[PDB]
């Protein structure tokens, strides 16, 4: 299987390249090797975009 990630804190994106999200939302990771912003898909909202890796933790 896979490892999902959960938001630890709310985050308001400044660009549509990034996701806005709320604490407790869950993500699948699309790409985590290019830098500390990870391309992710929100299972909670259905959106795909970058998330800051310091705002999430593995479930």
């Amino acid at each position: 299987g896979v490892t999902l990630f959960v938001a630890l804190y709310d985050y308001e994106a400044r660009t549509e390249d990034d996701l806005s999200f709320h604490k407790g939302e869950k993500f699948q990771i699309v790409n985590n090797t290019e830098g500390d912003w990870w391309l992710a898909h929100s299972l909670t909202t259905g959106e795909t975009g970058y998330i800051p890796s310091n705002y999430v933790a593995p479930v």
């Binding site: 804190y9 709310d10 985050y11 390249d17 990034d18 790409n31 290019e34 830098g35 500390d36 912003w37 990870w38 391309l39 970058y50 800051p52 890796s53 310091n54 705002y55």
Partner: peptide
């Protein structure tokens, strides 16, 4: 920088 390599936000 690329989107992936931008500075991270501070913790809230």
């Amino acid at each position: 920088v690329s989107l992936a390599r931008r500075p991270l936000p501070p913790l809230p």
